[PDB]
Write an enzyme that holds these catalytic residues in place. Sequence first.
Site, PDB file in Angstrom:
ATOM      1  N   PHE A  23      -7.637  13.869   1.659  1.00 40.94           N
ATOM      2  CA  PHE A  23      -7.213  15.252   1.874  1.00 40.94           C
ATOM      3  C   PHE A  23      -5.700  15.345   2.118  1.00 40.94           C
ATOM      4  N   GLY A  24      -4.927  14.774   1.190  1.00 40.45           N
ATOM      5  CA  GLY A  24      -3.462  14.859   1.222  1.00 40.45           C
ATOM      6  C   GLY A  24      -2.724  13.983   0.211  1.00 40.45           C
ATOM      7  N   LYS A  25      -1.474  13.663   0.543  1.00 42.35           N
ATOM      8  CA  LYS A  25      -0.661  12.741  -0.241  1.00 42.35           C
ATOM      9  C   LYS A  25      -0.482  11.464   0.574  1.00 42.35           C
ATOM     10  CB  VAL A  26      -0.700   7.916   0.088  1.00 45.63           C
ATOM     11  CG1 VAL A  26      -0.322   6.630   0.836  1.00 45.63           C
ATOM     12  CG2 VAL A  26      -2.170   8.254   0.307  1.00 45.63           C
ATOM     13  CG  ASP A 133     -14.650   4.636  -2.181  1.00 45.86           C
ATOM     14  OD1 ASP A 133     -15.380   4.793  -3.204  1.00 45.86           O
ATOM     15  OD2 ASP A 133     -13.527   5.172  -2.024  1.00 45.86           O
TER      16      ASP A 133
HETATM   17  N1  LIG Z   1      -6.084   6.391  -0.329  1.00 46.00           N
HETATM   18  C1  LIG Z   1      -5.894   5.282  -0.576  1.00 46.00           C
HETATM   19  C2  LIG Z   1      -5.681   3.929  -1.128  1.00 46.00           C
HETATM   20  C3  LIG Z   1      -4.387   3.910  -1.967  1.00 46.00           C
HETATM   21  C4  LIG Z   1      -4.089   2.809  -2.767  1.00 46.00           C
HETATM   22  C5  LIG Z   1      -2.915   2.805  -3.522  1.00 46.00           C
HETATM   23  C6  LIG Z   1      -2.034   3.889  -3.474  1.00 46.00           C
HETATM   24  N2  LIG Z   1      -0.899   3.895  -4.197  1.00 46.00           N
HETATM   25  C7  LIG Z   1      -0.019   2.902  -4.080  1.00 46.00           C
HETATM   26  N3  LIG Z   1      -0.114   2.079  -3.014  1.00 46.00           N
HETATM   27  C8  LIG Z   1       0.739   1.073  -2.809  1.00 46.00           C
HETATM   28  N4  LIG Z   1       0.624   0.265  -1.731  1.00 46.00           N
HETATM   29  C9  LIG Z   1      -0.095   0.464  -0.592  1.00 46.00           C
HETATM   30  C10 LIG Z   1      -0.976   1.408  -0.234  1.00 46.00           C
HETATM   31  C11 LIG Z   1      -1.368   1.009   0.989  1.00 46.00           C
HETATM   32  C12 LIG Z   1      -2.380   1.710   1.931  1.00 46.00           C
HETATM   33  C13 LIG Z   1      -3.783   1.936   1.358  1.00 46.00           C
HETATM   34  C14 LIG Z   1      -2.820   3.126   1.530  1.00 46.00           C
HETATM   35  N5  LIG Z   1      -0.743  -0.120   1.341  1.00 46.00           N
HETATM   36  N6  LIG Z   1      -0.008  -0.418   0.404  1.00 46.00           N
HETATM   37  C15 LIG Z   1       1.754   0.876  -3.772  1.00 46.00           C
HETATM   38  C16 LIG Z   1       2.679  -0.162  -3.660  1.00 46.00           C
HETATM   39  C17 LIG Z   1       3.673  -0.327  -4.627  1.00 46.00           C
HETATM   40  C18 LIG Z   1       3.760   0.534  -5.713  1.00 46.00           C
HETATM   41  C19 LIG Z   1       2.837   1.565  -5.835  1.00 46.00           C
HETATM   42  C20 LIG Z   1       1.837   1.738  -4.871  1.00 46.00           C
HETATM   43  N7  LIG Z   1       0.954   2.748  -5.002  1.00 46.00           N
HETATM   44  C21 LIG Z   1      -2.336   4.987  -2.670  1.00 46.00           C
HETATM   45  C22 LIG Z   1      -3.505   4.995  -1.920  1.00 46.00           C
END
Ligand SMILES: N#CCC1C=CC(=Nc2nc(Nc3cc(C4CC4)[nH]n3)c3ccccc3n2)C=C1
Lengths: 286, 286
Positions: A23-26, A133
């Site tokens: 429910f958002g952005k990372v 999951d």
């Molecule tokens: N929700 C959930 C899992 C997830 C998994 C991957 C993600 N994208 C992402 N995640 C990551 N790295 C990451 C993500 C995480 C943490 C699980 C959120 N720890 N490290 C990278 C690292 C380098 C280039 C691009 C990346 N993209 C974003 C979220």
Amino acid sequence: YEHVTRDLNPEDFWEIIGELGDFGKVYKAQNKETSVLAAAKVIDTKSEEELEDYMVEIDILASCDHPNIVKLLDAFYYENNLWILIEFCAGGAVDAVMLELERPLTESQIQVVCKQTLDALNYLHDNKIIHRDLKAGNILFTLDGDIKLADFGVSAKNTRTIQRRDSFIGTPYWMAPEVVMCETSKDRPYDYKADVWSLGITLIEMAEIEPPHHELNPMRVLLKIAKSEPPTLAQPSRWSSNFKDFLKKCLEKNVDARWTTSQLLQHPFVTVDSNKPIRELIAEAK
Amino acid sequence: YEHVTRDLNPEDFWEIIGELGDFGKVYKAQNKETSVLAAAKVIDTKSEEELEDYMVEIDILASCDHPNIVKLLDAFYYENNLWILIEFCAGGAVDAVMLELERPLTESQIQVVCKQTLDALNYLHDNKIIHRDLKAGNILFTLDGDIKLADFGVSAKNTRTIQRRDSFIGTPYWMAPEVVMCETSKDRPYDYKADVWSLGITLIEMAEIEPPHHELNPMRVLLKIAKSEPPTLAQPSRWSSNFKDFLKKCLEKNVDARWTTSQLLQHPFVTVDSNKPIRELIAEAK
Ligand SMILES: N#CCC1C=CC(=Nc2nc(Nc3cc(C4CC4)[nH]n3)c3ccccc3n2)C=C1
Ligand SMILES: N#CCC1C=CC(=Nc2nc(Nc3cc(C4CC4)[nH]n3)c3ccccc3n2)C=C1
């Protein structure tokens, strides 16, 4: 909460560098003091009763201590958002790598990921956690060619319900023998084996870039799983007998016959001890 | 909480008449406005985090609507005590009646109690509740010769965990077929069948005043359950073949072979429709 900070702005501690996903952005974050990198999940919560929904996830991350499971670095509740800061894996998700390179993993790469993923799962199951999951999108590569398992958003943790269940007072003359013998559903492998099936599908997903049934209308996929024999590798001559045998132990519809993580760790497909194939893969995507 | 009153003195609503039994004591109470009678459990809580431990019980009582399950009349948190007010059954517990009369129930009395208790249990299981403490001490007689099932202090309610489990987003390519088919432990009979074994022991307890193994050191009882074949009636010539056959369907160590409440309702031992034997019993103790 036990692991969630209040009254503090997360951005007084963590600086957003960019976006990793949506429910958002990372976000990609960097500690303003230590320069340590983090993924920051920022979850929009309407009210405070919603925090209860995200607490099992946070507790799992906080309670786990394994090399192949991502660690919790911080969590904050601030201005109607839950921030969860999770250790950073610089190589990205396994599925994102396959799509960027436009090819699947090789078998030797799958063995490394499988072996380390199985170590993570085995630890979880030992500690009464079901991931629920598992997929290539939740397996993340480190800079050193190792993996970490992530996303416990829908995981079950049966430790408090086992604690409450093992609790009684006075003489239990009416106790069922399966409760006496600790053979309730919480202690039995049955529900944990759902993760073992998903490992199997993840292995095929890593072998073929996409999981079985990716071409169907999404509405048909659950029906197809129910109707069909378990999936197999599309081009089986490409793959060793140990890969295919490993899959058959995971992708078994009879749950009792399906192997546990413990049994799977003794399989020759995961009897490897070098991540060199993954170091070669991440170096190619860089 | 959803069902618990704050800031109000329970004794401004309910007057304590006396003690019924003895984490607290249970009182006989009378509504000061309506004269309706209640059992009042007064549970000493140190802090407010303890209320969470008693909430599943309260939610079960509040959510159930069945003739053979006791209703919640009121709950209050006041001066470090949780008051739970529960509908009053003027005949007392089945085990207390046996001890006062110094004799067991007759078979026709057991059939009535069994039939109505089974109705209560079947309703619970249908609604994803495991009682977990079935015994003659938790079966209460009304003035009219009916029974109500009580004490959900250690019950499990699987409705919110099934709700959380059936919840997913996006296409679940990795979902295990047993999860697809709704054959997880929450929906399967396995864990609910613990109540069926306890019904069986309660039937013997009503036939012989005390449950099997009452003569052993309490420390040996769990071991005895594990080691032994299932218990049988001590003096089997006293009892009909339908009683003994019913027991064998309950007191079956193979859980898969053990009957469900649904199956048991079709058994000739519970095919009765008059409480006359219980009306005669309660009138004798009065
Ligand atoms: N929700 C959930 C899992 C997830 C998994 C991957 C993600 N994208 C992402 N995640 C990551 N790295 C990451 C993500 C995480 C943490 C699980 C959120 N720890 N490290 C990278 C690292 C380098 C280039 C691009 C990346 N993209 C974003 C979220
Ligand atoms: N805890 C728990 C269950 C329980 C069961 C019985 C009990 N004692 C008791 N209980 C009751 N009746 C009763 C108890 C309840 C309610 C389950 C607490 N509803 N009615 C009576 C009724 C008449 C004479 C003597 C009685 N003694 C006290 C507690």
